[PDB]
Amino acid sequence: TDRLKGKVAIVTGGTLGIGLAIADKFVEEGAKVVITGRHADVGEKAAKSIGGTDVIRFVQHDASDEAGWTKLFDTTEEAFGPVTTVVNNAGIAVSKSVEDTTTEEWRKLLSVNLDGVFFGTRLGIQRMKNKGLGASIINMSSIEGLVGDPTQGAYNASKGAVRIMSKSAALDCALKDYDVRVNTVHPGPIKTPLVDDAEGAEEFFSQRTKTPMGHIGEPNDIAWICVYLASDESKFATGAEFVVDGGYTAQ
Amino acid sequence: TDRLKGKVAIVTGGTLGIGLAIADKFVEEGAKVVITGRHADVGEKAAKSIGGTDVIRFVQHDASDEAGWTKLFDTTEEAFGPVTTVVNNAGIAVSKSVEDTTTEEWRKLLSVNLDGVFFGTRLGIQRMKNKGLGASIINMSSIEGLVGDPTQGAYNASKGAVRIMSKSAALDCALKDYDVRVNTVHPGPIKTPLVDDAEGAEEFFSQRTKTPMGHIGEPNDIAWICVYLASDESKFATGAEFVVDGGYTAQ
Amino acid sequence: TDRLKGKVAIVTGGTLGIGLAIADKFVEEGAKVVITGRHADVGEKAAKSIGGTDVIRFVQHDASDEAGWTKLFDTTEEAFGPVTTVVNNAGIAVSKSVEDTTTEEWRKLLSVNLDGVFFGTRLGIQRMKNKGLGASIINMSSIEGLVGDPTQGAYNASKGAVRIMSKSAALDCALKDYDVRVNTVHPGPIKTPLVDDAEGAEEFFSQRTKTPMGHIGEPNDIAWICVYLASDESKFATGAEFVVDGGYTAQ
Amino acid sequence: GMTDRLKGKVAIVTGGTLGIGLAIADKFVEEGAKVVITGRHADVGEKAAKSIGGTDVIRFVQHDASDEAGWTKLFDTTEEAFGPVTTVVNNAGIAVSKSVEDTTTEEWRKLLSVNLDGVFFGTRLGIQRMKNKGLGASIINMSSIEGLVGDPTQGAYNASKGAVRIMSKSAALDCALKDYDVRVNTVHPGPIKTPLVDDAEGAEEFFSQRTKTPMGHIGEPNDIAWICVYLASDESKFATGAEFVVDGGYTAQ
């Protein structure tokens, strides 16, 4: 039995890392999937590496581009039918303390990590409510929405915003019987291009004082909890935080 | 396609309500299960409803009886092989505020809800560590381990204890590369005999000021998260809290 | 006897409501205080209502105005000497679900509630670090930085961002021995002009299902926890959340 | 001029003869409260009381917090000395350096009888004795950062402090819904220099590592006393069911 039977998903930033693995396991469990990203070559190769146009397709869309979001839903519904599932995964990092954060860096990171999740959640509610789809919006927070990090100040702001904004949306949808659920996923450190391109990041976060398991995670670790959250298995889960972090926040 | 292929699970209180559904879906995903209960009559047919002696068996056992835990593991192990999965689900309730709680009520509830979880977790670590089994201890807390209830004082105490004790155990297992994960599950109100017997409770907890979804969940809602937590899909999840509560704690 | 002897505090949005009472009790405990606000008429009287130019002054400044923050510190230090204490209290509300929030409303609320706190915290760290001042940055979050509200989506986002960004700042100041602490305050409902102008709000949040105490608080309730956080009494408190909410988030 | 922040209050501080409790007793008296401190060792207890003030403001009572019957005599004794009790600090607690795996059942029951049952006995009796008297009554239950995060080598302690954390919310809610005029809150110290820490070899050094306490040092008993003063005063009349964390940044990372 396919765990995402009948589901049609948008996965922002689905061409690399966590987003790519969410896409991969979404198709594996029966979902039609549109992945987005900014770079077209990367995006088209990523999509075909999972399957053909009958199951998965790439759409060039910056998650911070408000107007492009309506085209994204229209295109996705054209190819596969009504969207049932939105994974707001696109996100960037900035290695600066609050003290050392430039306003340009601040605004740039928030435009993607916060405005883009807002745009996808607001539009996802409008387009998916009251259709009996078992709709599910999965917003990618982080353990950095739960704890602080002295060199990720703007990132911390954005992931904590996503954490609580998601509860507002969850509550509204539940109280209004919209048949739309909203939850946040909080990965610990995961081996991705994001982490690979940060020199010494994996060794640093593999320290026992950081990740008690003594190693960082893999993209599939996050894909599988997103499968649970996209599926009707989680029909009673809303407004909740799902932490897959090697024990990071437990100490 | 069997998400729990090769797993051997103990499920305390697995003859009614949430425990019964956990066993049901554990076997559907390929796991041998031993369920426990104090009443041999109710417990014997409960085992048969899911299947036969090649998948599931009943073992009479009070969760607060420390010596029986050793017999429970021995019994399970020669029946099905080395135990891989422990779901500490057995629990009782008392409808008293802290002020109105008698010491006998206090002690009785904690012997099951706190001592029993301790016995299963402690022995579960001893018997499952260092065997490459992908061991998982799943400790049933509650939303009542996350927020208070004015007339569930003893219950709140037990569920907050389970919440943080599981983190201790998760951290020690991770730091010692024991290959045992420990997580807690936090159901909101769920239609079970425990709830069916408290008169007017389902209606009370279906109010929007309690559960935002306007209804209470079903035992299968808790079964599917335990499936995720018992499987190797969650191998980076330890010391974390998984909340399935219809939005109850999100407001 | 004076619990804030020698302290020099900037209190943004100090002309009404909570900020006014913070300023009041700060001057009462021997702090020198600059309050800010947008309306000069209201602000000059607000300052005069507490004391003369020797203990308190008003500066017209919009917390979203980044360049003005540098002038605001300069003006405060000219008047009273080096700033020891920054209370990022200016904030606004928008009564819209996520689904109904206009992008105009989103950007406007975040410019005050989030950018304003970022500007104040970042400059505060730069201007107060390494000067033996027992410096303290107090960032005004809300219970709405902890739980969601279906009709305050952007507000929830802002208060969640403030909650976790403040931890980042607290950690970096602690690790670098800056002698700057950073904490967040999380009021529940408080009788202020913000609540009074919102028709039916006080009645709604006084419901026992919302505030278990059956009434909302008053500005001095937040003033006194801010005095504690500004004083050297709290020299071991950093990165933490101080909730004064009538029991709102305890259920 | 300023004013005694605990004028008219009457406090019971369990385990108030050493460490955090002693500092809570000391600053409670400084702020105008009348205090009874408890402890198991009368020698330590009687000198503790005398070091803070006379019997007009503070007295010692030998009492084991696990001893339910003694709680009644304790409140009776405090009433006769000072008047109706207004403030209960459930501070007595002990530790056990064992993982969950390595905890003997005897270590388990002993720690919980003090850390959990003792806080239950004091909270329940505090409510019964202080409800409906308009005293501005406040129950302060001593949890820990170890009621918020785990520690691999304090499994029973973690259990006890997580229980205190949530049981206090139950009591806060019932008290508020019933208009008892009794607030209940928990305090969560990070590592604090006390006899409990001093007697654990290498504990202060371990918890001074930046990976544990970002401030690079542990706190002192007055750090906890001053938040308890706030919680006992009518200044916190709108605070109930909440967690007050004074930990040098430990749980912020």
Ligand SMILES: NC(=O)c1ccc[n+]([C@@H]2O[C@H](COP(=O)([O-])OP(=O)(O)OC[C@H]3O[C@@H](n4cnc5c(N)ncnc54)[C@H](OP(=O)(O)O)[C@@H]3O)[C@@H](O)[C@H]2O)c1
């Ligand atoms: N890696 C971790 O340790 C970790 C931990 C916790 C949370 N997270 C979160 O999980 C999410 C995935 O992170 P990751 O580690 O997989 O990052 P990654 O390896 O850098 O992948 C980034 C993906 O997002 C796309 N992307 C970047 N900017 C975008 C924009 N403006 N609009 C649309 N798409 C964009 C990228 O494609 P293009 O470059 O072609 O646009 C790429 O497909 C992020 O939200 C991150 O904050 C990551």
Ligand SMILES: NC(=O)c1ccc[n+]([C@@H]2O[C@H](COP(=O)([O-])OP(=O)(O)OC[C@H]3O[C@@H](n4cnc5c(N)ncnc54)[C@H](OP(=O)(O)O)[C@@H]3O)[C@@H](O)[C@H]2O)c1
């Ligand atoms: N129902 C809810 O809304 C809800 C919500 C959150 C959390 N929970 C938690 O989830 C767990 C299951 O609750 P439920 O609603 O399924 O309870 P339930 O309907 O009362 O079923 C409890 C099961 O536990 C067994 N049990 C009772 N006392 C026992 C003991 N001393 N030793 C061993 N087994 C015992 C019972 O069998 P016998 O009668 O034969 O002993 C029964 O099989 C509990 O830990 C509860 O605290 C429940």
Ligand SMILES: NC(=O)c1ccc[n+]([C@@H]2O[C@H](COP(=O)([O-])OP(=O)(O)OC[C@H]3O[C@@H](n4cnc5c(N)ncnc54)[C@H](OP(=O)(O)O)[C@@H]3O)[C@@H](O)[C@H]2O)c1
């Ligand atoms: N009241 C509650 O129940 C409650 C609960 C939780 C949190 N809070 C938070 O507490 C803080 C104060 O709220 P309140 O209820 O006291 O609000 P209020 O009664 O509306 O007072 C707000 C104060 O901030 C000033 N202000 C508004 N916009 C500003 C800007 N852009 N720059 C500088 N100052 C500005 C106002 O003066 P001008 O209008 O003249 O500028 C006024 O002095 C806010 O951060 C709010 O989010 C309030």
Ligand SMILES: NC(=O)c1ccc[n+]([C@@H]2O[C@H](COP(=O)([O-])OP(=O)(O)OC[C@H]3O[C@@H](n4cnc5c(N)ncnc54)[C@H](OP(=O)(O)O)[C@@H]3O)[C@@H](O)[C@H]2O)c1
């Ligand atoms: N120190 C820390 O770093 C830290 C951090 C977080 C929380 N805490 C908590 O803070 C509280 C105080 O700890 P502390 O570090 O100040 O401990 P401490 O220095 O060991 O002092 C403990 C006090 O409690 C008394 N006590 C011990 N067992 C008792 C019992 N059964 N009944 C009554 N009194 C008893 C002791 O007196 P006798 O010796 O006369 O019995 C002593 O007066 C405890 O709840 C602890 O769990 C401590």
Ligand SMILES: O=C1c2ccccc2C(=O)N1O
């Ligand atoms: O992007 C990241 C990351 C990179 C490297 C280590 C930890 C983390 C984390 O927690 N998030 O969200």
Ligand SMILES: O=C1c2ccccc2C(=O)N1O
């Ligand atoms: O025992 C209970 C209960 C009873 C009635 C409604 C909800 C709940 C819950 O969440 N737990 O744990």
Ligand SMILES: O=C1c2ccccc2C(=O)N1O
């Ligand atoms: O501004 C507010 C407010 C107004 C009225 C009721 C509750 C609240 C709250 O929680 N915040 O933050």
Ligand SMILES: O=C1c2ccccc2C(=O)N1O
């Ligand atoms: O009792 C203690 C203790 C002792 C030594 C170091 C840390 C801690 C702590 O967090 N609690 O609660």
Ligand SMILES: [Mg+2]
């Ligand atoms: Mg902006």
Ligand SMILES: [Mg+2]
């Ligand atoms: Mg709540």
Ligand SMILES: [Mg+2]
């Ligand atoms: Mg931590």
